[PDB]
Amino acid sequence: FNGLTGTGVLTESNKKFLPFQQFGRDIDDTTDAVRDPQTLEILDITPCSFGGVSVITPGTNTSNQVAVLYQGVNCTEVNVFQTRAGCLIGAEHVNNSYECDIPIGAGICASYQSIIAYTMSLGAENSVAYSNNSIAIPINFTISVTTEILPVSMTKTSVDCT
Amino acid sequence: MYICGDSTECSNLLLQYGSFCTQLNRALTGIAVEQDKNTQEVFAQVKQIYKTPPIKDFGGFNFSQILPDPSKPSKRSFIEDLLFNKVTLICAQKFNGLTVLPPLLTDEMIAQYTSALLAGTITSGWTFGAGAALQIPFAMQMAYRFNGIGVTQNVLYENQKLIANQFNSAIGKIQDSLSSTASALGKLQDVVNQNAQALNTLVKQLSSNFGAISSVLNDILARLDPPEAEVQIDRLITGRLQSLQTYVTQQLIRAAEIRASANLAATKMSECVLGQ
Amino acid sequence: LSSTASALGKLQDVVNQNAQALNTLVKQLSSNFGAISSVLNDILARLDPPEAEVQIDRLITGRLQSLQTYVTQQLIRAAEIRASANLAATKMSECVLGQSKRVDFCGKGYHLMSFPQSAPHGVVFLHVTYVPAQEKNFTTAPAICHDGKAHFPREGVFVSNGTHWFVTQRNFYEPQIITTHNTFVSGNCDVVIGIVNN
Amino acid sequence: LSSTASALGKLQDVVNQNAQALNTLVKQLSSNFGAISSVLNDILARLDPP
Amino acid sequence: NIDGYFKIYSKHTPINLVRDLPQGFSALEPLVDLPIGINITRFQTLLALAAYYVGYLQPRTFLLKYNENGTITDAVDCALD
Amino acid sequence: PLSETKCTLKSFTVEKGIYQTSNFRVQPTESIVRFPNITNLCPFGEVFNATRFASVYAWNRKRISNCVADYSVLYNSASFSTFKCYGVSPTKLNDLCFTNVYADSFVIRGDEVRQIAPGQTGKIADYNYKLPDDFTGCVIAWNSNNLDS
Amino acid sequence: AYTNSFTRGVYYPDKVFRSSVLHSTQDLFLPFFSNVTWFHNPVLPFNDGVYFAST
Ligand SMILES: *[C@@H]1O[C@H](CO)[C@@H](O[C@@H]2O[C@H](CO)[C@@H](O[C@@H]3O[C@H](CO)[C@@H](O)[C@H](O)[C@@H]3O)[C@H](O)[C@H]2NC(C)=O)[C@H](O)[C@H]1NC(C)=O
Ligand SMILES: *[C@@H]1O[C@H](CO)[C@@H](O[C@@H]2O[C@H](CO)[C@@H](O)[C@H](O)[C@H]2NC(C)=O)[C@H](O)[C@H]1NC(C)=O
Ligand SMILES: *[C@@H]1O[C@H](CO)[C@@H](O[C@@H]2O[C@H](CO)[C@@H](O)[C@H](O)[C@H]2NC(C)=O)[C@H](O)[C@H]1NC(C)=O
Ligand SMILES: *[C@@H]1O[C@H](CO)[C@@H](O[C@@H]2O[C@H](CO)[C@@H](O)[C@H](O)[C@H]2NC(C)=O)[C@H](O)[C@H]1NC(C)=O
Ligand SMILES: *[C@@H]1O[C@H](CO)[C@@H](O[C@@H]2O[C@H](CO)[C@@H](O)[C@H](O)[C@H]2NC(C)=O)[C@H](O)[C@H]1NC(C)=O
Ligand SMILES: *[C@@H]1O[C@H](CO)[C@@H](O[C@@H]2O[C@H](CO)[C@@H](O)[C@H](O)[C@H]2NC(C)=O)[C@H](O)[C@H]1NC(C)=O
Ligand SMILES: *[C@@H]1O[C@H](CO)[C@@H](O[C@@H]2O[C@H](CO)[C@@H](O)[C@H](O)[C@H]2NC(C)=O)[C@H](O)[C@H]1NC(C)=O
Ligand SMILES: *[C@@H]1O[C@H](CO)[C@@H](O[C@@H]2O[C@H](CO)[C@@H](O)[C@H](O)[C@H]2NC(C)=O)[C@H](O)[C@H]1NC(C)=O
Ligand SMILES: *[C@@H]1O[C@H](CO)[C@@H](O[C@@H]2O[C@H](CO)[C@@H](O)[C@H](O)[C@H]2NC(C)=O)[C@H](O)[C@H]1NC(C)=O
Ligand SMILES: *[C@@H]1O[C@H](CO)[C@@H](O[C@@H]2O[C@H](CO)[C@@H](O)[C@H](O)[C@H]2NC(C)=O)[C@H](O)[C@H]1NC(C)=O
Ligand SMILES: *[C@@H]1O[C@H](CO)[C@@H](O[C@@H]2O[C@H](CO)[C@@H](O)[C@H](O)[C@H]2NC(C)=O)[C@H](O)[C@H]1NC(C)=O
Ligand SMILES: *[C@@H]1O[C@H](CO)[C@@H](O)[C@H](O)[C@H]1NC(C)=O
Ligand SMILES: *[C@@H]1O[C@H](CO)[C@@H](O)[C@H](O)[C@H]1NC(C)=O
Ligand SMILES: *[C@@H]1O[C@H](CO)[C@@H](O)[C@H](O)[C@H]1NC(C)=O
Ligand SMILES: *[C@@H]1O[C@H](CO)[C@@H](O)[C@H](O)[C@H]1NC(C)=O
Known part of the structure; x- marks a missing residue:
């Protein structure tokens, strides 16, 4: 448009231009709305979809298939399953809740038992039998041994300049 | 996407600077991954998910102000709602390259974790941190807690009503402080302000000449011949690289202190709530 | 420990991070950075000073930037390792040379004692803990008033097996008959809520 | 305290580190950095803008 | 009159005061741009078949605020106080 | 995609987890161009066909606007x-x-x-006549040895 | 006579549409809270521009 080169999708805009402007800018330098030089209407501009790709795999040593997650893209234009962190292709949706090993996001995560995506479960749910006239006391005991690992230092390296 | 906006030749020139891009992506990914472990290690300290019984015979103490409210979209309590109101959706990646990722644990799961912790603390004392929860009446748990600081236990059993009324009044007095002095939550706003300012500076430093003839790549690529446009394409990569490096360094430095604060919060939860 | 692997992930991660950083630094030595060649020997043996100095300046500034980046990353990592070492020293001083009373510090349960062992670049702690089990739940009471005098337990708790009352310690079930050598009297049984005759 | 030296090591080390950093920052103004001269007024006074 | 360009802005609103310039804010929307390229130092007003104010502009930094519809609502003069 | 993962990790074995490989964008097609209706020819030629030129200290200054400039016909001239x-x-x-x-x-x-x-x-x-420190279009010089000599 | 020009002399600097933003610009403006000289045909100076009101 008159030397203004751009890429994106054009839509009929709603914002009102005073009779002496030519184009608008959302913030800083973001040319979003433009008035054409011939037919004298206003069209707004927005870039078309783009974004990263992630691969969910159970491991080559176990299986040989993967699933693909498109980040922040409403994939109606690319078993498709629409999540809040993009959308997942290659996985099936189930109702059951387990504890998962491959977190995806927004409370949704997937695993392989092929390649099912579900909602993680916090843990086993139980209710304590509270009363104002009864207590519980142990009768037996066990001795347990636990391990923990803590690093204290790393290697010493000296690099010259010349 | 940030340095060479949707261009082809600019990427071919950027390939000559070695690999000053795997490091930045790796560092940002590491920070993003660590941000999830920070939240995981604090709240996720209870194995099961307990819940309070419908019986509300706690000896006189009134916990209705902190227990979850079923008639709520998020099943939160009164104080959590007050806190949420006092702090001010498929988000796509902008043409700058900016991207915001959603947290792994949504707010509902955090609310469930806190509710489970509170129910266990009320109905089992400190016995649910070692092994299985062992029920004990609340009055006797509070008497045991007095016995732990020197005061004998017959002080509570003859002053139960006074202590209950004082606790109820003290709990009630906190709603006014939270809903009237909005400046109390100053520790949770400085982080957001600093992050916003840093990212705003990063975005705003895109429209700078840096010694070139234009601040936008398309203008240079549509006017200068390719033999002599290579000089003006440079002096533009070498400013954006420095901007990105500075942003990454400050992000790492300010994430270190967040990690330290998360560790302190985890310690406080471990030995202040579970025990005495 | 002998069978299950991946129990030493932290040390392996530290070593891998160091190796990756050093390998990237060495690998960054083969970039043109805008010059004509990636080796100074060819540039010096193929040109005259007037523009050889320009090429050398380009290479020098690129390599200096890379080295500064590496040094800064190393400083950050060293600070993190120092924090971890301070935590390890505190745990060694508190849980090995004494007995710890703070919860969620050493082990999951009631701490008893600990043993240190070495590691390639760290330390391994073996904590011994006491965990109760085989629970059983009884009927209780806060105080017992006899002849109008309320008796409270010195250390323990009143329980009933169904017909009789005993005083037991909290963490283990050892019933004892109620005498005046393990209970103390304070007041009268008119203000306490839960008084049981006995 | 009044006889043995090198007792307050940490505070002296901190002060020395700060002083050394400031001194090495100030000492950088004399570097040529590949220009003709390290002084700016003179190099402005002996050359044309280009 | 800048770099060979004569630019004329204007506005027209009624007021209720009868003494002097009223209290309020109102932006000026441009009318005329001319590529003349001339030197101007003095000016004079012509009559019809009497009362006007004259002020002089100076370089300055302003902070303008826009509303939802794209009209200036207020401004801040940086070098005032 | 598994080959992409192997390339990114630079190994023939990949462990359980989620990995980021690359990014995708939608390729645009059918370019569009818009220009005004003004199509009147422009007097550039007269500038080069002025029968009389001026001295250096008083150089002829002309302004051009509302034209359809053509330089391809001007460039190919020898x-x-x-x-x-x-x-x-x-x-x-x-x-x-x-x-x-x-x-x-x-x-x-x-x-x-x-x-x-x-x-x-x-x-x-x-x-x-001093040119500024920034770009000003460009200059053209042609020999004339039959009018002013 | 002299009069106070309270908040007069603001114009649109550029032909660019903006909305719900705060924009910092630098241009030739009439300073806030200055004198305007009332007049009544005298020739007048043209320093860098003239804000000309009327009634
Ligand atoms: C447009 O007209 C102005 C008239 O002011 C031209 O500027 C120069 O203005 C000065 C007075 O301001 C005229 O007087 C001269 O002043 C100098 C400096 O004080 C003095 O040394 C001289 O002896 C003389 O008194 C000056 O004549 C005038 N310049 C010219 C060429 O007349 C301005 O140059 C005019 N613009 C154009 C494009 O011609
Ligand atoms: C993702 O794409 C779908 C399909 O285009 C969107 O669903 C449509 O949304 C529009 C806008 O509100 C509605 O007018 C249509 O009726 C919807 N159609 C269907 C079949 O649902 C959806 O809104 C998009 N979501 C996001 C977050 O962009
Ligand atoms: C403790 O007393 C109660 C009396 O029923 C028992 O524990 C509860 O049993 C009810 C059965 O209706 C369950 O619904 C509750 O969930 C139980 N409470 C828990 C699991 O905390 C039980 O009989 C007694 N405990 C033992 C060890 O015998
Ligand atoms: C719990 O507290 C109550 C009140 O102090 C005890 O007494 C019960 O009171 C309710 C009405 O509030 C009556 O319906 C019950 O019949 C009372 N219980 C008895 C045994 O008389 C109660 O005993 C306490 N313990 C339990 C297990 O409820
Ligand atoms: C407490 O637990 C221990 C260990 O579980 C029990 O000891 C075991 O008892 C069973 C059956 O009596 C024997 O077959 C095992 O050989 C015992 N193990 C050891 C190491 O001696 C003990 O009986 C439990 N105590 C009670 C009162 O039930
Ligand atoms: C615990 O506190 C809550 C909040 O003050 C009490 O709820 C009040 O109940 C009375 C009686 O129905 C109502 O008139 C108030 O409007 C309630 N407060 C609110 C904020 O709605 C509750 O009654 C207290 N618990 C007990 C056992 O009294
Ligand atoms: C100890 O302090 C408490 C409160 O701090 C006193 O209780 C108050 O007593 C007055 C006088 O009867 C009442 O008007 C208040 O309502 C009471 N407050 C509460 C919360 O119940 C108590 O009297 C003091 N005891 C002594 C011995 O001075
Ligand atoms: C509760 O404890 C009492 C006290 O030991 C039990 O009473 C004893 O029962 C045994 C049964 O073999 C008799 O030999 C003793 O003589 C009884 N002692 C007294 C003082 O009577 C009682 O059986 C226990 N009840 C339950 C349900 O465990
Ligand atoms: C504990 O015993 C006392 C007396 O030994 C009981 O108090 C008496 O109870 C009787 C029966 O209701 C009344 O007629 C008397 O007026 C009460 N007072 C006195 C001084 O005798 C008391 O009720 C008993 N407690 C329980 C829980 O049974
Ligand atoms: C900005 O534009 C909006 C959109 O037209 C104006 O809102 C209109 O105001 C008029 C006058 O009150 C109403 O009759 C219309 O119904 C409104 N439009 C809508 C869609 O409700 C608004 O007045 C303008 N000015 C400001 C300051 O907002
Ligand atoms: C003056 O204008 C004429 C007309 O455009 C130019 O003459 C043309 O010159 C080219 C190349 O010399 C020829 O191919 C055309 O046939 C000529 N056309 C005519 C009508 O003569 C001339 O070049 C212009 N003057 C200058 C100095 O360029
Ligand atoms: C430009 O030309 C087209 C077709 O000749 C016409 O429809 C349009 O109205 C013209 N533009 C203006 C501003 O008149
Ligand atoms: C790798 O595959 C082998 C053969 O199927 C299997 O025995 C082994 O357990 C696998 N390893 C893992 C970590 O799953
Ligand atoms: C749960 O499973 C049933 C059939 O087993 C299915 O119809 C339903 O859609 C599932 N739930 C959701 C939320 O999809
Ligand atoms: C306007 O001029 C008068 C006298 O010339 C002076 O007293 C007054 O301070 C001036 N106004 C301002 C705002 O300076």
Whole structure:
């Protein structure tokens, strides 16, 4: 448009231009709305979809298939399953809740038992039998041994300049 | 996407600077991954998910102000709602390259974790941190807690009503402080302000000449011949690289202190709530 | 420990991070950075000073930037390792040379004692803990008033097996008959809520 | 305290580190950095803008 | 009159005061741009078949605020106080 | 995608987890171009066909606007001696759309034609006609030995 | 006579549409809270521009 080169999708805009402007800018330098030089209407501009790709795999040593997650893209234009962190292709949706090993996001995560995506479960749910006239006391005991690992230092390296 | 906006030749020139891009992506990914472990290690300290019984015979103490409210979209309590109101959706990646990722644990799961912790603390004392929860009446748990600081236990059993009324009044007095002095939550706003300012500076430093003839790549690529446009394409990569490096360094430095604060919060939860 | 692997992930991660950083630094030595060649020997043996100095300046500034980046990353990592070492020293001083009373510090349960062992670049702690089990739940009471005098337990708790009352310690079930050598009297049984005759 | 030296090591080390950093920052103004001269007024006074 | 360009802005609103310039804010929307390229130092007003104010502009930094519809609502003069 | 993962990790075995490989974008097609209706020819030729030129100290200044500029017909002409063009480009002048054009026409001797360039001093470039430190279109010089000689 | 020009002399600097933003610009403006000289045909100076009101 008159030397203004751009890429994106054009839509009929709603914002009102005073009779002496030519184009608008959302913030800083973001040319979003433009008035054409011939037919004298206003069209707004927005870039078309783009974004990263992630691969969910159970491991080559176990299986040989993967699933693909498109980040922040409403994939109606690319078993498709629409999540809040993009959308997942290659996985099936189930109702059951387990504890998962491959977190995806927004409370949704997937695993392989092929390649099912579900909602993680916090843990086993139980209710304590509270009363104002009864207590519980142990009768037996066990001795347990636990391990923990803590690093204290790393290697010493000296690099010259010349 | 940030340095060479949707261009082809600019990427071919950027390939000559070695690999000053795997490091930045790796560092940002590491920070993003660590941000999830920070939240995981604090709240996720209870194995099961307990819940309070419908019986509300706690000896006189009134916990209705902190227990979850079923008639709520998020099943939160009164104080959590007050806190949420006092702090001010498929988000796509902008043409700058900016991207915001959603947290792994949504707010509902955090609310469930806190509710489970509170129910266990009320109905089992400190016995649910070692092994299985062992029920004990609340009055006797509070008497045991007095016995732990020197005061004998017959002080509570003859002053139960006074202590209950004082606790109820003290709990009630906190709603006014939270809903009237909005400046109390100053520790949770400085982080957001600093992050916003840093990212705003990063975005705003895109429209700078840096010694070139234009601040936008398309203008240079549509006017200068390719033999002599290579000089003006440079002096533009070498400013954006420095901007990105500075942003990454400050992000790492300010994430270190967040990690330290998360560790302190985890310690406080471990030995202040579970025990005495 | 002998069978299950991946129990030493932290040390392996530290070593891998160091190796990756050093390998990237060495690998960054083969970039043109805008010059004509990636080796100074060819540039010096193929040109005259007037523009050889320009090429050398380009290479020098690129390599200096890379080295500064590496040094800064190393400083950050060293600070993190120092924090971890301070935590390890505190745990060694508190849980090995004494007995710890703070919860969620050493082990999951009631701490008893600990043993240190070495590691390639760290330390391994073996904590011994006491965990109760085989629970059983009884009927209780806060105080017992006899002849109008309320008796409270010195250390323990009143329980009933169904017909009789005993005083037991909290963490283990050892019933004892109620005498005046393990209970103390304070007041009268008119203000306490839960008084049981006995 | 009044006889043995090198007792307050940490505070002296901190002060020395700060002083050394400031001194090495100030000492950088004399570097040529590949220009003709390290002084700016003179190099402005002996050359044309280009 | 800048770099060979004569630019004329204007506005027209009624007021209720009868003494002097009223209290309020109102932006000026441009009318005329001319590529003349001339030197101007003095000016004079012509009559019809009497009362006007004259002020002089100076370089300055302003902070303008826009509303939802794209009209200036207020401004801040940086070098005032 | 598994091959992409192996390339990114630079190994033949990948462990359980989620990995980021690359990014995708939608490729645009069917380019569109919009231009105004003004299509009147422009008097550029007259600028080069002025029968009389002016001295250096008083150079002819002309303003050009509301035209359809054509430089391809002007570039392919071989009647010019030098066409050293700073600023933008010799050939890419047909795809750019400007606001106004300034034409400065005069006559100079053969020993000062080189001095007409930004960022340099001299005799006629310092006291008669000085170009600014930024780009100003570009210059054209052609020999004439039958009118003023 | 002299009068106070309270908040007069603001114009649109550029032909660019903006909305719900705060923009910092630098241009030739009439300073806030200055004198305007009332007049009543005298020739007047033209320093860098003239804000000309009327009634
Ligand atoms: C447009 O007209 C103005 C008139 O002011 C030209 O500027 C120069 O203005 C000065 C007075 O301000 C005129 O007087 C001269 O002043 C100098 C410096 O004080 C003094 O040394 C001289 O002896 C003389 O008194 C000056 O004549 C005038 N310049 C010219 C060429 O007349 C301005 O140059 C005019 N613009 C154009 C494009 O011609
Ligand atoms: C993702 O894409 C779908 C399909 O285009 C969107 O669903 C449509 O949304 C529009 C806008 O509100 C509605 O008018 C249509 O009726 C919807 N159609 C269907 C079949 O649902 C959806 O809104 C998009 N979501 C996001 C977050 O962009
Ligand atoms: C403790 O007393 C109660 C009396 O029923 C028992 O524990 C509860 O049993 C009910 C059965 O209706 C369950 O619904 C509750 O969930 C139980 N409470 C828990 C699991 O905390 C039980 O009989 C007694 N405990 C033992 C060890 O015998
Ligand atoms: C719990 O507290 C109550 C009140 O102090 C005890 O007494 C019960 O009171 C309710 C009405 O509030 C009556 O319906 C019950 O019949 C009372 N219980 C008895 C045994 O008389 C109660 O005993 C306490 N313990 C339990 C297990 O409820
Ligand atoms: C407490 O637990 C221990 C260990 O579980 C029990 O000891 C075991 O008892 C069973 C059956 O009596 C024997 O077959 C095992 O050989 C015992 N193990 C050891 C190491 O001696 C003990 O009986 C439990 N105590 C009670 C009162 O039930
Ligand atoms: C615990 O506190 C809550 C909040 O003050 C009490 O709820 C009040 O109940 C009375 C009686 O129905 C109502 O008139 C108030 O409007 C309630 N407060 C609110 C904020 O809605 C509750 O009654 C207290 N618990 C007990 C056992 O009294
Ligand atoms: C100890 O302090 C408490 C409160 O701090 C006193 O209780 C108050 O007593 C007055 C006088 O009867 C009442 O008006 C208040 O309502 C009471 N407050 C509460 C919360 O119940 C108590 O009297 C003091 N005891 C002594 C011995 O001075
Ligand atoms: C509760 O404890 C009492 C006290 O030991 C039990 O009473 C004893 O029962 C045994 C049964 O073999 C008799 O030999 C003793 O003589 C009884 N002692 C007294 C003082 O009577 C009682 O059986 C226990 N009840 C339950 C349900 O465990
Ligand atoms: C504990 O015993 C006392 C007396 O030994 C009981 O108090 C008496 O109870 C009787 C029966 O209701 C009344 O007629 C008397 O007036 C009460 N007072 C006195 C001084 O005798 C008391 O009720 C018993 N407690 C329980 C829980 O049974
Ligand atoms: C900005 O534009 C909006 C959109 O037209 C204006 O809102 C209109 O105001 C008029 C006058 O009150 C109403 O009759 C219309 O119904 C409104 N439009 C809508 C869609 O409700 C608004 O007045 C303008 N000015 C400001 C300051 O907002
Ligand atoms: C003056 O204008 C004429 C007309 O455009 C130019 O003459 C043309 O020159 C080219 C190349 O020399 C020829 O191919 C055309 O046939 C000529 N056309 C005519 C009508 O003569 C002339 O070049 C212009 N003057 C200058 C100095 O360029
Ligand atoms: C430009 O030309 C087209 C077709 O000749 C016409 O429809 C349009 O109205 C013209 N533009 C203006 C502003 O008149
Ligand atoms: C790898 O595959 C082998 C053969 O199927 C299997 O025995 C082994 O357990 C696998 N390893 C893991 C970590 O799953
Ligand atoms: C749960 O499973 C049933 C059938 O087993 C299915 O119809 C339903 O859609 C599932 N739930 C959701 C939320 O999809
Ligand atoms: C306007 O001029 C008068 C006298 O010339 C002076 O007293 C007054 O301070 C001036 N106004 C301002 C705002 O300076």
